[PDB]
């Protein structure tokens, strides 16, 4: 449309040397040109100074200072982040991640790495403390490394045990802009794909993660600037006490990529274990089952909201299931299970990080058991089957799945309590005059092998119907 | 094509007429690469190729028929 | 296809000149993006042109075989 | 058909207590004051199976007391037949149900119902 009048004014131009002479006279006499350049870096052909130009464009894009010394060597330069492609330290590592991205045509991941390296050193201090602040992170990282190695000294456990029940976790050290990732949990479903063997080339995203970092806060805290574990209790870790240290206006963080919904009693348990307040302002509490459903539905997004009204449907092989997750059922205190989304847990010194993680592992395990109901499969109002189930919270870390007896007509309620990360105990609750359905250890076996409600309910139904 | 326009923009950020006339001469080279010898739509090229394939097939089949056929014994 | 090639040529020519000239008189992202589209489509048509050149060489060999079989028939 | 099946259908499709009352009327043409059919017994059995009572069937029983569907005598007998006593939550629920009708405890019927209220007390 506008191109038609553009071609008409172009026909008027046919009816430019004077324009070049005008540009020359102005030469004898900003943002737009560089913006067009940064759009057009996509269309540059592969060549050595052109790739230097596109890397300079990445530098201008993420706010960093480019400097070439040749067509080979180009430096990205800011107050501490200084590295080349061919402050206060060497250029440490020829890291294969950045080189592997740049040897291919993967410049956006290079941009993400420079974004992460900006967000590491964007701390508010006058730059001197910044160095010391980064040093504190280094000390923390070293301590964290030792603890995982201490666990590897303790038992020669596989990576799965290192994830599920060990100290720290599967620990990927930092490399470029990617900060240090602890994998504290991987579910029995998310372990499997479409039956994964878990050998030490395990994926970064294969589970639930938490990245450790430093961040400037509004308060002042005392953090170590030295590797705090010089002496190690041979099966534990043991920390020499503080001061060294200095009172940086910052704190360590465990940032989760996807915010975890946690209950109120979790908030008090973690503020007891840490000592530092978690929610600086008090947030707006919500029922946990809303947040669990928003978490599980916002895993795989679609533009249509499900409009569930807490009545989820499950299409299974030899069965069809319905679930009522039943928020606002009252606890013994008289209130529903109220929780909020946590994303950043602040700790001061690294000895807290196993205990903290055990708490989060507990919480994440509980969410997976309530995560298995939240599905998008709509087998709406099918007259065959639709075994109508209910989930209610009797307490923190306990819940109950209530459902019709497969033989008789009284209710049967299976109460599940999540003791630890991989241990969930189960009790069948039955009328005094009913049929034998299952033993509790069978329910514990199916739960710990699958970590999903509907699979265990089908196991209950099938082992009832064989008898 | 377009990286020369990029160099003209880079020269404008630096400051010229030379690369502009080189772009004009490049469009003259574009005329020389419009010379080749193809003018029909590619559908018409496909029609011509299929018709000529059928022609060579039927002519070879006729000549093979008269290779094999003797009117006399 | 020559008409579409040449229209893309002259359009690219004088509209890129317009973009250069408005840069020069300033010291227009939409017509920029359309120039990007015209450049890509022109390069695609040049690839189709080289393919049709291969097709025409095949056609020349094929019509030589046509004339040889015609001479055998006659 | 049975009272257990009607209460259990009332649990399956979520019925509010008044819709439960209407559909309970519709399932059974003879009311039989609902105490011949032992409404309080079936509601207490299928409410007190878990460690904690499901609030749906307790809401059904609290409506069936506050509205005068079920006499106090049948409720007090069905409360008396529970024991177990290892679960404090079910016992607290039974004491709230007793907190509803106690101090009121007024039969308005035949004298045999009043004798039944005496034995139930």
From Swiss-Prot, chain A:
Residue ranges of the region described as Interaction with ESR1: 4-467
Q: Which keywords has UniProt assigned to this entry?
A: Acetylation, Activator, DNA-binding, Nucleus, Phosphoprotein, Repeat, Transcription, Transcription regulation
Tissue distribution: Ubiquitously expressed.
Any one GO MF term held by the record is: RNA polymerase II cis-regulatory region sequence-specific DNA binding
Q: Kindly list any coiled-coil regions of this protein.
A: none
What processes in GO biological process is this protein linked to? androgen biosynthetic process; angiogenesis; animal organ regeneration; brain development; cell morphogenesis; cellular response to epidermal growth factor stimulus; cellular response to hepatocyte growth factor stimulus; cellular response to steroid hormone stimulus
* Chief location category: nucleus
UniProt key word Transport: no
Query: Which Gene Ontology cellular component terms are annotated?
Result: chromatin; core mediator complex; mediator complex; membrane; nucleolus; nucleoplasm; nucleus; protein-DNA complex
Subcellular location per UniProt equals:
Nucleus
Kindly list the cysteine pairs connected by disulfide bridges: none
Give me the ranges of the annotated region Interaction with the Mediator complex and THRA.
1-467
Q: Which domain of life is it from?
A: Eukaryota
What function is annotated for this protein?
Component of the Mediator complex, a coactivator involved in the regulated transcription of nearly all RNA polymerase II-dependent genes. Mediator functions as a bridge to convey information from gene-specific regulatory proteins to the basal RNA polymerase II transcription machinery. Mediator is recruited to promoters by direct interactions with regulatory proteins and serves as a scaffold for the assembly of a functional preinitiation complex with RNA polymerase II and the general transcription factors.
What's this protein's family per the entry?
Belongs to the Mediator complex subunit 1 family.
Q: What is this protein called?
A: Mediator of RNA polymerase II transcription subunit 1
From Swiss-Prot, chain B:
Q: Which GO terms describe its biological process?
A: positive regulation of transcription elongation by RNA polymerase II; positive regulation of transcription initiation by RNA polymerase II; RNA polymerase II preinitiation complex assembly
Cellular component, GO, one term: mediator complex
Q: Which residues carry this modification: Phosphoserine?
A: 41
What Gene Ontology molecular function terms does this protein carry? transcription coregulator activity
Q: What is its main location?
A: nucleus
Report keywords, A-Z: Acetylation, Activator, Coiled coil, Nucleus, Phosphoprotein, Transcription, Transcription regulation
- Superkingdom is Eukaryota
Cell compartment(s), UniProt = Nucleus
Q: Which residues form a coiled coil?
A: 43-70
Answer yes or no on keyword Transcription regulation: yes
- Which purpose does this protein serve, as stated in its record? Component of the Mediator complex, a coactivator involved in the regulated transcription of nearly all RNA polymerase II-dependent genes. Mediator functions as a bridge to convey information from gene-specific regulatory proteins to the basal RNA polymerase II transcription machinery. Mediator is recruited to promoters by direct interactions with regulatory proteins and serves as a scaffold for the assembly of a functional preinitiation complex with RNA polymerase II and the general transcription factors.
Please give the family membership noted in the entry.
Answer: Belongs to the Mediator complex subunit 9 family.
Which protein are we looking at?
A: Mediator of RNA polymerase II transcription subunit 9
Swiss-Prot record, chain C:
Q: Which UniProt keywords apply?
A: Acetylation, Activator, Coiled coil, Nucleus, Phosphoprotein, Transcription, Transcription regulation
Q: Which residues form a coiled coil?
A: 1-23
Please give the Gene Ontology molecular function terms for this protein: nuclear thyroid hormone receptor binding; nuclear vitamin D receptor binding; transcription coactivator activity; transcription coregulator activity
Q: Name one GO biological process term.
A: positive regulation of transcription elongation by RNA polymerase II
GO cellular component term, pick one: nucleus
The lineage's top-level taxon is: Eukaryota
Q: Which residues carry this modification: Phosphoserine?
A: 7
Q: Where does the record place it?
A: Nucleus
Q: Which family does it belong to?
A: Belongs to the Mediator complex subunit 4 family.
Q: How does it assemble?
A: Component of the Mediator complex, which is composed of MED1, MED4, MED6, MED7, MED8, MED9, MED10, MED11, MED12, MED13, MED13L, MED14, MED15, MED16, MED17, MED18, MED19, MED20, MED21, MED22, MED23, MED24, MED25, MED26, MED27, MED29, MED30, MED31, CCNC, CDK8 and CDC2L6/CDK11. The MED12, MED13, CCNC and CDK8 subunits form a distinct module termed the CDK8 module. Mediator containing the CDK8 module is less active than Mediator lacking this module in supporting transcriptional activation.
Listed name of the protein: Mediator of RNA polymerase II transcription subunit 4
Boundaries of the shown chain within the full protein: 26 to 108 of 270
Swiss-Prot record, chain D:
Found, by tissue, as follows:
Ubiquitous. Abundant in skeletal muscle, heart and placenta.
Kindly list the cysteine pairs connected by disulfide bridges. none
Membrane-crossing segments per the record: none
Q: Which domain of life is it from?
A: Eukaryota
Q: Where in the cell is it found?
A: Nucleus
The similarity annotation says: Belongs to the Mediator complex subunit 24 family.
Quaternary data: Component of the Mediator complex, which is composed of MED1, MED4, MED6, MED7, MED8, MED9, MED10, MED11, MED12, MED13, MED13L, MED14, MED15, MED16, MED17, MED18, MED19, MED20, MED21, MED22, MED23, MED24, MED25, MED26, MED27, MED29, MED30, MED31, CCNC, CDK8 and CDC2L6/CDK11. The MED12, MED13, CCNC and CDK8 subunits form a distinct module termed the CDK8 module. Mediator containing the CDK8 module is less active than Mediator lacking this module in supporting transcriptional activation.
What the protein does comes down to:
Component of the Mediator complex, a coactivator involved in the regulated transcription of nearly all RNA polymerase II-dependent genes. Mediator functions as a bridge to convey information from gene-specific regulatory proteins to the basal RNA polymerase II transcription machinery. Mediator is recruited to promoters by direct interactions with regulatory proteins and serves as a scaffold for the assembly of a functional preinitiation complex with RNA polymerase II and the general transcription factors.
Name listed for the protein in its UniProt record: Mediator of RNA polymerase II transcription subunit 24
Organism, scientific name: Homo sapiens
Its gene name is MED24
The stretch of the full-length protein covered here is 4 to 124 of 989
